[PDB]
A = this chain, B = another copy of it.
């Protein structure tokens, strides 16, 4: 039986006797916070730990709060260099609740980490009998146990009675096939998100600029459009070094280049299918290699 390390970032999500049949599980408490307080330090802590301990286990499961699991999933998808499977898992209902989803979520997550088929597929989020790539996976509902989906290109496979049927694999480069390497970073570049809406104030953007933020993600309207005020600030900020990425508050679909913004004229980067919090993850990492907008755009076209 394979040896699987369980990395915990909060409390239990489940106690699950059926684990014995699949793997020799070992547990470690890495940090203990709710996922709404996730932060850079924990991301570095996690990636370094998976990367260093990679030869010591047959694979990792990370228990994590569902609220920002999509962010941590994508961060590890760009920075883990361990070829073995790294699977993330949460629960939408308390462990003590009726019909708690945790126990079977943790079981199915271990099934995935123990399956040789899951290697070289990137960081995975396993939820509601579904194997999801860390890039496209997002939380779509505030309460539904089925909440995690890949709303653009879909899941990688499904789990029925302990066996995964794999039928898709993502084209974007992940994990050991990416240039990012955080093993020697104690700090990620400062990147913030600003929302767009009718009559949107430019003060949130002006504040991140006056703080010297390395980059700013715009949660645009429609295909990455910006409210006039916010537009002007970010355009000024771009001309003085600040990287700005046009994402969208719209939950599915890409923010494309050659849309309604002349990104070349202003030095802006389009985020494609990466939603704002995910666009932030790539921009942070991108800023560890380059400040140049055309090169940041190439990166957003590749990862």
Contacts and interface: CB of A to CB of B under 8 A. Distances in A.
Interface in A154-207: 154-155, 158, 160-161, 165-172, 188, 190, 192-201, 203-207
B222 A139 contact: yes
Contacts of A66: 222
**Residue picked from A150, A197, A201, most chain B C-beta under 10 Å:** A197
B250 A141 contact: yes
B203 A211 contact: yes
Contacts of A193: 195, 197, 200
Nearest to A150: B154
Contacts of A103: 98-99
Contact of A224 (B142, B169, B200, B222): B142
B195 A195 contact: yes
Contacts of A255: 142
A105 interface: yes
Interface string A216-236: 000111111111100000000
A20 to B, nearest CB: 13
Q: How many copies does the complex hold?
A: 4
A21 to B, nearest CB: 12
A13 to B, nearest CB: 10
Given A35-B222, A39-B198, A43-B198, 5 more contacts: A140-B250, A147-B250, A165-B254, A169-B171, A249-B277
A256 interface: yes
A155 B151 CA distance: 10
B142 A199 contact: no
A134 interface: no
Contacts of A10: none
B167 A172 contact: yes
Nearest to A33: B228
**Residue picked from A155, A190, A254, most chain B C-beta under 10 Å:** A254
A225 B40 contact: no
A73 B280 CA distance: 30
Contacts of A105: 99
A241 interface: no
Given A167-B172, A168-B154, A195-B194, A252 B203 contact: no
Nearest to A229: B37
Q: Which 8 A-B pairs have the closest CB atoms?
A: A154-B154, A142-B253, A204-B204, A99-B104, A251-B251, A67-B222, A38-B198, A146-B146
